[PDB]
Design a protein around this ligand. Structure first.
Ligand SMILES: *[C@@H]1O[C@H](CO)[C@@H](O[C@@H]2O[C@H](CO)[C@@H](O)[C@H](O)[C@H]2NC(C)=O)[C@H](O)[C@H]1NC(C)=O
Ligand SMILES: *[C@@H]1O[C@H](CO)[C@@H](O[C@@H]2O[C@H](CO)[C@@H](O)[C@H](O)[C@H]2NC(C)=O)[C@H](O)[C@H]1NC(C)=O
Ligand SMILES: *[C@@H]1O[C@H](CO)[C@@H](O[C@@H]2O[C@H](CO)[C@@H](O)[C@H](O)[C@H]2NC(C)=O)[C@H](O)[C@H]1NC(C)=O
Ligand SMILES: *[C@@H]1O[C@H](CO)[C@@H](O[C@@H]2O[C@H](CO)[C@@H](O)[C@H](O)[C@H]2NC(C)=O)[C@H](O)[C@H]1NC(C)=O
Ligand SMILES: *[C@@H]1O[C@H](CO)[C@@H](O)[C@H](O)[C@H]1NC(C)=O
Ligand SMILES: *[C@@H]1O[C@H](CO)[C@@H](O)[C@H](O)[C@H]1NC(C)=O
Ligand SMILES: *[C@@H]1O[C@H](CO)[C@@H](O)[C@H](O)[C@H]1NC(C)=O
Ligand SMILES: *[C@@H]1O[C@H](CO)[C@@H](O)[C@H](O)[C@H]1NC(C)=O
Lengths: 49, 123, 113, 197, 50
């Protein structure tokens, strides 16, 4: 079917067609951020006298 | 304006360099430097090479009959190239040269036949 | 085959070739014949025998210091000039550079013997 | 220079994809080299430079229009001198001089316009005189030794015998040449004269 | 050389050639042999003798 879509045809002639690449899909995601525990000083920046 | 090219002996031998200024007529400015060894060719003013009167076979071509090489204490030199060996045939209306012996010679010839085949996935 | 094209299959006269393979290509070994030692001989367009003009059939008329011989063009191997080596066309009046010498007839001694 | 002539800001932006300039130069260099190779393969067939013989009677055959004319400052044959005068080149010499392009503003010379935009024409490796010398060597060899010249050693032969061999080659018995030598030489000489005209 | 290839070195039977130089190229002068006056004769493939 990949060959048929590439060729815009519902008929394929005898021969060898290239069909893109073998692909691998991801299964899960990894999220890594530094282990920061404090909230930023929003009060000091925006609530200053 | 332009016109600059560099004549280099391989760097695994030496770092002497000659520079050709294509639009400069030294017979001397619009150059980066002089330092003597200034020779005018029809291909530009060549600075940093010694012109000699000894014609040789060409090594590094420059243009307009001038070619350079690196030689004896070795420096870059320039010369007008030789086109071939001087020779001469006799011409007479009553004399013929005829071979009396021969040589069997085998020479080689090399030709490409095919190119590496490739394929590209644009994605 | 054997080529007659100048410089097509190498320098000299081509005799034969042998291919060898190579990465992405072909290498040919070309075997040729090259003339070597040579000598300077006197020559002439024709030999005049009895008033008739003799031309070589397959060769050139060649003279050493005292005698005329006929040789193949590419190799110095002198033959006696005979009526079998020459052909006759016309008389000795037209060709420029005609020399005399004689042309041998192999039949006359048989008729005499 | 073509893209960002005299502009620092443009140059710094060109550098964001300047690998393309390198490839353009690589391609043009490959052509430039090939063009000298082509010249050498066509003309430098023989590396033995045979001196053009003195002109002497070759058996009625007149080669003066194909052989170099010694009275000229450049020893071109009469025919070559004509060929060179007929083909027109855009300019001559490879030295243009900044000072001349600066001075002659009024002419609006196309060559200077090309130079200022980074477009350069390079000199050939062989000069016209060098080419003429190869041509003369080939003719000198042909006249004194025929084809033995290319095969190996040049073996001298009388010119009329060279022609006799050429006649047997096409398939006409050699006696024809010797009997009609004056006719043949005259037609030959006539034909060459017609070509120059 | 001398060539047997038809029209390769000019029309007619090739005898010899002479190169001439030109800007950016080469000019060849090709000398060839051309049959001229001709006559029609009766022919036969063979002669029968005895
Ligand atoms: C030209 O060739 C002839 C034939 O070979 C030479 O004459 C012969 O010379 C030998 C001695 O070397 C004699 O025994 C023969 O009787 C000679 N034959 C004839 C027909 O005279 C001749 O000497 C050579 N000429 C030159 C100048 O070398
Ligand atoms: C070949 O031999 C003939 C004689 O058989 C020579 O012919 C004579 O040449 C002289 C030249 O002074 C004339 O006066 C005679 O009348 C000619 N005689 C005949 C019968 O034609 C001829 O010159 C010789 N050729 C060569 C090349 O030696
Ligand atoms: C080859 O032919 C040319 C003519 O095309 C000859 O040149 C003439 O020679 C005479 C005598 O010296 C001069 O008066 C003429 O002015 C020349 N004409 C030209 C156009 O140059 C030449 O001499 C012949 N050469 C040979 C070897 O036969
Ligand atoms: C073969 O053709 C040639 C060339 O046309 C003839 O030679 C010409 O003959 C006329 C008449 O005598 C002369 O006026 C010309 O000057 C000749 N031309 C040349 C270049 O010499 C020749 O007669 C013909 N017949 C043959 C060879 O039998
Ligand atoms: C600013 O101070 C007021 C109390 O006066 C508080 O209600 C508000 O949340 C503070 N704002 C921030 C950004 O902390
Ligand atoms: C340099 O200038 C001189 C004087 O005008 C001239 O004779 C010479 O040919 C020029 N050199 C070149 C390479 O054009
Ligand atoms: C043939 O004659 C020429 C002219 O005299 C001479 O230069 C050459 O050396 C001679 N040589 C041979 C056959 O080697
Ligand atoms: C060869 O040339 C000489 C002049 O050098 C001349 O005397 C002789 O007759 C000519 N011979 C032939 C056959 O043309």
């Amino acid at each position: 079917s990949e060959t048929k879509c590439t060729l815009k045809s519902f008929t394929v002639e005898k021969g060898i067609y290239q069909t893109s690449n073998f692909r691998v899909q991801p299964t899960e995601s990894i999220v890594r951020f530094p282990n920061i525990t404090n909230l930023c000083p929003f009060g000091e920046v925006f609530n200053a006298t | 304006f332009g016109g600059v090219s560099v004549i280099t002996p391989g760097t695994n031998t030496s770092n002497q360099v000659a520079v050709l200024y294509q639009d400069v007529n030294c017979t001397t400015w619009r150059v980066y430097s002089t330092g003597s060894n200034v020779f005018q060719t029809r291909a530009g003013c060549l600075i940093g090479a010694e012109h000699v009167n000894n014609s040789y076979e060409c090594d590094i071509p420059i243009g307009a009959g001038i070619c350079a090489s690196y030689q004896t204490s070795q420096s870059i030199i320039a010369y007008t190239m030789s086109l071939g060996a001087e020779n001469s045939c006799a011409y007479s209306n009553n004399s013929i040269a005829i071979p009396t012996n021969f040589t069997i010679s085998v020479t080689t010839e090399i030709l490409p036949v095919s190119m590496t085949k490739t394929s590209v996935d644009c994605t | 085959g054997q080529s007659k094209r100048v410089d097509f299959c190498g320098k000299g006269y081509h005799l034969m070739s042998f291919p060898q393979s190579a990465p992405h290509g072909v290498v040919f070994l070309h075997v040729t014949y090259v003339p070597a030692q040579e000598k300077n001989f006197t020559t002439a367009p024709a030999i005049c025998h009895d008033g008739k003009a003799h031309f070589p059939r397959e060769g050139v008329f060649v003279s050493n210091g005292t005698h005329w011989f006929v040789t193949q063009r590419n190799f110095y191997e002198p033959q006696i000039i005979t009526t079998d080596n020459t052909f006759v066309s016309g008389n000795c009046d037209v060709v420029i550079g005609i020399v005399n010498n004689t042309v041998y007839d192999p039949l006359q001694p048989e008729l005499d013997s | 220079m073509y893209i960002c002539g005299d502009s620092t800001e443009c140059s710094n932006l060109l550098l964001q994809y300047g690998s393309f300039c390198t490839q353009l130069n690589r391609a043009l260099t490959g052509i430039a080299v090939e063009q000298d190779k082509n010249t050498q393969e066509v003309f430098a067939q023989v590396k033995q430079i045979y001196k053009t013989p003195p002109i002497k009677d070759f058996g009625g055959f007149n080669f003066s229009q194909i052989l170099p004319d010694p009275s000229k400052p450049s020893k071109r044959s009469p025919i070559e001198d004509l060929l060179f005068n007929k083909v027109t080149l855009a300019d001559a010499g490879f030295i243009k001089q900044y000072g001349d392009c600066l001075g002659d503003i009024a002419a609006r010379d196309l060559i200077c316009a090309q130079k200022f935009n980074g477009l350069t024409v390079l000199p050939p490796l062989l000069t016209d005189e060098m080419i003429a010398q190869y041509t003369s060597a080939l003719l000198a060899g042909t006249i004194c030794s025929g084809w033995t010249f290319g095969a190996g050693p040049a073996l001298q032969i009388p010119f009329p015998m060279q022609m006799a061999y050429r006649f047997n080659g096409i398939g006409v018995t050699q006696n024809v040449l010797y009997e009609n030598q004056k006719l043949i030489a005259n037609q030959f000489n006539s034909a060459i004269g017609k070509i120059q005209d």
